[PDB]
């Protein structure tokens, strides 16, 4: 739904940026 979507999307954009600057450090 319009509530899940939304949510998963969130936590799927944060788990990619964590990934990103443990890579950078």
């Given at each position: 739904?319009?509530?899940?979507?939304?949510?998963?999307?969130?936590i799927?954009?944060?788990l990619?940026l964590?990934?990103?600057?443990?890579?950078?450090?």
């Amino acid at each position: 739904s319009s509530d899940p979507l939304v949510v998963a999307a969130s936590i799927i954009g944060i788990l990619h940026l964590i990934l990103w600057i443990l890579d950078r450090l």
